[PDB]
Amino acid sequence: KTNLANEDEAYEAIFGGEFGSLEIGSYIGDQLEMVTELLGGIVPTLQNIVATVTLGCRLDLKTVALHARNAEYNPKRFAAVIMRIREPKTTALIFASGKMVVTGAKSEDDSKLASRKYARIIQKIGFAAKFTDFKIQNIVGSCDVKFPIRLEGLAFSHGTFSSYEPELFPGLIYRMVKPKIVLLIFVSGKIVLTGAKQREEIYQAFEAIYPVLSEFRKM
């Protein structure tokens, strides 16, 4: 009963995954591939930022798709226009309602700036679009503690906060409480941090987890 040519169902899909908008690449094109792409004196690094913009006016996606340069619109597959720009290299999903979702940036400034570009593009085509309600919805961070994790022991010891689920992910899924951050922990020591609303939460989730990962070093 999942229809992605529906608008209410296609927007809700981007944020309703197991990992919410971490999975946003599957709607602009594997489960394991989506995570591992987000890797490529230890300090985390921002790998993606998902933002939402309300453009304000009803949009005719056939028109938008026609006049946009690098753009794709198959309304049977997914119910939005897929537009891309080259700097900040990003991707936007533009709905019939003027809602817009903007992914690909790696700074909070690139996210807001890219979003302003997509909005201006849509105006220039000929719409009463105004850039409003810019919110950052998710920030994905990555980390590499550069030493291997005894995941099988961390899964037992922190079973309250952990799962091993090969179907979803080949490593450990750490659901941290404060801050509410899911850490995807690889056996090699690389980590993918998601859920964050501000970058502070990425560093906090990392500072919290580094002493835990140390206790579980494989030697």
Swiss-Prot record:
Upper lineage: Eukaryota, Fungi, Dikarya, Ascomycota, Saccharomycotina
Sequence repeat spans: 46-122, 136-213
Subunit structure: Binds DNA as monomer. The 1.2 MDa TFIID complex is composed of TATA binding protein (TBP) and the 14 TBP-associated factors. One copy of each TAF1, TAF2, TAF3, TAF7, TAF8, TAF11, TAF13, two copies of each TAF4, TAF5, TAF6, TAF9, TAF10, TAF12, and three copies of TAF14. Interacts with TFC8.
Keywords (A to Z) from UniProt: DNA-binding, Nucleus, Repeat, Transcription
Protein name (database record): TATA-box-binding protein
Family: Belongs to the TBP family.
Function description: General transcription factor that functions at the core of the DNA-binding general transcription factor complex TFIID. Binding of TFIID to a promoter (with or without TATA element) is the initial step in preinitiation complex (PIC) formation. TFIID plays a key role in the regulation of gene expression by RNA polymerase II through different activities such as transcription activator interaction, core promoter recognition and selectivity, TFIIA and TFIIB interaction, chromatin modification (histone acetylation by TAF1), facilitation of DNA opening and initiation of transcription.
Domain of life (superkingdom): Eukaryota
Gene: SPT15
Transmembrane regions: none
MF annotations from Gene Ontology: chromatin binding; disordered domain specific binding; DNA binding, bending; DNA-binding transcription factor binding; RNA polymerase I general transcription initiation factor binding; RNA polymerase II core promoter sequence-specific DNA binding; RNA polymerase II general transcription initiation factor activity; RNA polymerase II-specific DNA-binding transcription factor binding
Gene Ontology CC terms, in alphabetical order: nucleoplasm; nucleus; protein-containing complex; transcription factor TFIIA complex; transcription factor TFIID complex; transcription factor TFIIIB complex; transcription regulator complex
GO biological process per UniProt: DNA-templated transcription initiation; negative regulation of DNA-templated transcription; nucleolar large rRNA transcription by RNA polymerase I; positive regulation of transcription by RNA polymerase II; regulation of transcription by RNA polymerase III; RNA polymerase I preinitiation complex assembly; RNA polymerase II preinitiation complex assembly; RNA polymerase III preinitiation complex assembly
